[PDB]
Write a protein that binds this ligand. Structure first.
Ligand SMILES: [Fe+3]
Ligand SMILES: [Fe+3]
Ligand SMILES: [Fe+3]
Ligand SMILES: [Fe+3]
Ligand SMILES: [Fe+3]
Ligand SMILES: [Fe+3]
Lengths: 171, 171, 171, 171, 171, 171
């Protein structure tokens, strides 16, 4: 591509991996959203939070697709794997699962940053710094905050805990 | 589920298939969108059309996920398969590929309607009629309209055809 | 200077080189702008694009002049060399020339980043990342997009191509 | 902490040092503010500038306290040492003292950046770049500008110099 | 100072002690604020209350610095001692600690009033009465109210107590 | 060119010389602007005046480029020579240097008018009269006014002179 400059095939390949992972995260969140939409779960603010997380992960993916094209890389999409579970058990356990997902995505972003840093690609390094790393830190901190509150309230055994958390923190 | 009533396992299973197909269509459209975002394609109104189609297919999927829960069915997600191509060749050829996709989705919707009709599920039949069948017919007609105009202008060999179509019809 | 801190003479010297290069780019763009203002060219939206690029390159230069003073460096201006051509031949060929200019400026910015990175000057590295690197990537991608469209339309031999591109993309 | 990821104890410890230093700077500025509030000094725009600097340094500290918690570090506060002087002698001499303070804070920030850079913590590196390094450069440049103007006017011996500077530059 | 009138060195010295104590209180509150900002505490309305208390104590200090200068006294700042704890254990226990702090500050204010009263300084006596004594009484009463409610709800053992108190009373 | 009429090659050549001179003046003013932006000069209203003069000289150049094309002449750009100095010593001395520059530009404009007048080109004569000659006279008078005020105040030896002039006349 006549636009390609200082853009290594390792960086290009790692961006394609990150694209698939962000789409994967979007899919996990979509699953969690409609799990709490079930009539036997019915925590609709949990559902709404997870649904919005799904749309945001989808935007995360598209911005990587955009920068791949901007730099002259070539997008190669892969299957979006179905999530590990069909049922997420409880509100606090879904959030704990989400925390592990965000930490895995974060580690993959840090690995992506290392690849671009090794190939002296400061455009990509700051693109990741600007658009992903602090977003990830904030998302992880928030999930940690929420898991702490839920567990301290006795969730999931305390049947009032996730109901009230859904009303107060998630509204 | 205590909400489940007049809802057959065949209908439930066919809804889960339709959910995956709508997500698949969303993924095909996402691929087409960023294909025309490439610096060696650069038909950004084609890209914008396909990007919006992707978001709409995603909404189509979520509404089926919603009605599955409303009726007491249980959502089972599957892998979202990557599209058949990585490159869609040209604007007119992508639209012709999109036309075949919409017709496949339409046939799967008609097959879904037949299943629900066989099990005398009028709620599901009218849900499909109201929210999907006319949308599908309109989408197919529109793609047919556009392919006709592009081919009559000589696309893709006429290099001016997709450029002007992108400016006039897709703006 | 009592403000100077962690600011190496290599970085200072490379900033002065970048200042002259940005001014040079401004001058090339000014030349291209009034070339298409000629009565025997008369692509006034090409002219207007290039004129605005010239003013923007001038701002790029002034921001480097500002950061040189902020860090306690000392500005040393050099001749602004006249462009390589007096005539840019055609709209598509001027844009292809502009693409090569932006890539040269981009490489000089990346070289500047490497100098500041070697001397562990994170203020300058992020100043370049924040204000120049993504701007450069976007400018290169845009020029690539436009050259692709023009050449696919047959420019410059197709006399309708640059006229219509001037009306649709450059208006 | 379940949020902690890629966060080294050296970085954590250096953040705690920076927190105390920013609070220290806030305290120095508070001292300078009410020094010029004295009836035998009575340069109230100097006082107002220094008072606002004190509040800003306090915000600088709190943002480091925030990022320490975001990353799962643990805040350890230390005594805020009283400033080196009780009396700052004159407007120009206080600003010269402030310049040395900002340069010391700047060097501690650069040392903090080096620690995080050594441990490949790009989140912290860009957090420092985004929120502190350019702020520091601008603050140092401004103090340098002002000291130059005051000394050229003959401050503090010229009794009119700090009075007029207080009215024109500090209003 | 030519402004000094009816202003005893004992009063001056006691004002300097009160200044340091108000700054100390500000520092204790800052510590409490970011303690509940921890991911393993995450009572953000507790954090926000304590953060605002910290800013208010800082204003309390500055108003004493102002009246010291107004009367011709001379400000002598001392170290701001770090708080007694790094961790405040729980919401109710932090508020109980805050109650003891406010009572200590209140007793120091009453001792300050006695000094000024002994030296027949009615300006200072009414300055303390107007700006500090009723503020202190209201702050103590409020903390007492809140501790009563928390303990009656079973805090900290009842994991729901501080969560709901944070939502209802502290929002 | 089919638009060329009553337009002599001497006039055309002299316009190209004037274009380069106006760009040269723009460059001198840019140098002066960031000279007073130095931390050891820091007369920011001098800097702002000179910066605006630079942009205006650039407009002067572009209007000559425009009229060259309007008349069917052909623009030939030359190197923009760096200014004679890197440092302009003081505010009053920079303005005295600017005065000599404006007088040189004025003489070149008068010489240009004589060329066009000799070739009986009344369009060009009135274009110069309308757009340049009175602007030049006003700019020279203003610089003369300012140098008179600065020198009468004792600039540059009187350190208060340029500071106050920067605040009163240049704000
Ligand atoms: Fe993400
Ligand atoms: Fe669909
Ligand atoms: Fe540039
Ligand atoms: Fe600071
Ligand atoms: Fe207080
Ligand atoms: Fe001029």
């Amino acid at each position: 591509p006549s636009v390609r400059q200082n853009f290594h095939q390792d960086s290009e390949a790692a961006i394609n991996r990150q694209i698939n992972l962000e789409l994967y995260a979007s899919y996990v969140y979509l699953s969690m959203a409609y799990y709490f939409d079930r009539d036997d779960q019915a925590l609709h603010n949990f559902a709404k939070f997870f649904k919005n997380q799904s749309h945001e992960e989808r935007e995360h993916a598209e911005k990587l697709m955009k920068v791949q094209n901007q730099r002259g890389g070539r997008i190669f999409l892969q299957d979006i794997k179905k999530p590990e579970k069909d049922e997420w058990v409880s509100g606090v356990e879904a959030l704990e699962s989400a925390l592990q997902l965000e930490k895995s995505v974060n580690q993959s972003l840090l690995d992506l940053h290392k690849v671009c840093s090794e190939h002296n690609d400061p455009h990509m390094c700051d693109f990741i710094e600007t658009h992903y790393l602090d977003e990830q830190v904030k998302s992880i901190k928030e999930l940690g905050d929420w898991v702490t509150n839920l567990r301290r309230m006795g969730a999931p055994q305390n049947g009032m805990a996730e109901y009230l958390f859904d009303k107060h923190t998630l509204g």
